[PDB]
Amino acid sequence: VSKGEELFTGVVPILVELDGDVNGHKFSVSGEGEGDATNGKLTLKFISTTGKLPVPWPTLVTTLVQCFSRYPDHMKRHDFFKSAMPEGYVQERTISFKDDGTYKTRAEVKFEGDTLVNRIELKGIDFKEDGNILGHKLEYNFNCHNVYITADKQKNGIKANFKIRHNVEDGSVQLADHYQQNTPIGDGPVLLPDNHYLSTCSVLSKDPNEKRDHMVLLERVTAAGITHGMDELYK
């Protein structure tokens, strides 16, 4: 139902580049891997190229390609992300860490040749040097979350909102409120969805042969929350 959707039928290579600055601590991350939108699956590896990161890897997961979500066939007209391809979309977020600093991110996600590329700038401010983030108190894991999507007709795009819960080493939770906006880079028509959500799960691991600070990530994402006619009546 979109020309962009056809670019995701197989396994697609992914490259990611992030340039970050948190409280003045500059860092750069490079990633690579592959996505299978048919199954909603990604496999990615990320490395720091600037030494040990000043923030925990889990805090960067949501910033580091929702075009790889599995939209079931009945919901295909609600997939804004693929409909913006190949020209792509700008993804912007504010991430407010409760009782701590804020990230602002701006990314461009688009095809460059055969490859889906996510290029990100991240600025973080007002973090506490002994808080859960700069103190590296977050466990190396990730919970599943639901990302709620709404259309933004005025900007010809979408908004999203969700709360990330990062487990803390003392058994508490560090909340990160996410506010997201996506707008197309191209002029062509895009799909503006009805209200729905993405069900996302992520598994973080390490590569025994990788000497740089790094993260290996597997993710599974499935869109949900659209219902039609009287379907739910016939149980």
| 147/142 Cα distance (integer angstroms) | 14
Q: How far apart, in whole angstroms, are the C-alpha atoms of residue 225 and residue 233?
A: 16
Strand, coil or helix: 233 = helix
Q: Letter for the amino acid at 107? A: A
DSSP three-state, residue 167: strand
Residue 139 neighbours by CB under 8 Å, 6+ apart: 58, 166, 167, 168, 169
Radius of gyration of the chain (CA): 18
Q: Is residue 148 part of a domain?
A: yes
Strands 115-125 and 12-22: parallel
Residue 100 belongs to domain with CATH number: 2.40.155.10
Is 141 a member of any domain? yes
- Range(s) of the domain holding residue 222: 4-226
Domains identified in the chain, total number: 1
Contact 29, 64 (CB under 8 A): yes
Resolution (in Å) of the shown entry?
A: 1.4
Please report where in the chains the tokens 């701006």 appear, as a residue.
Answer: 106
* Residue 59 within a domain: yes
Whether 231 is covered by a domain: the verdict is: no
235 within a domain of the structure (yes/no): no
- The answer to whether position 220 is within a domain reads yes
Experimental technique for the deposited model: X-ray
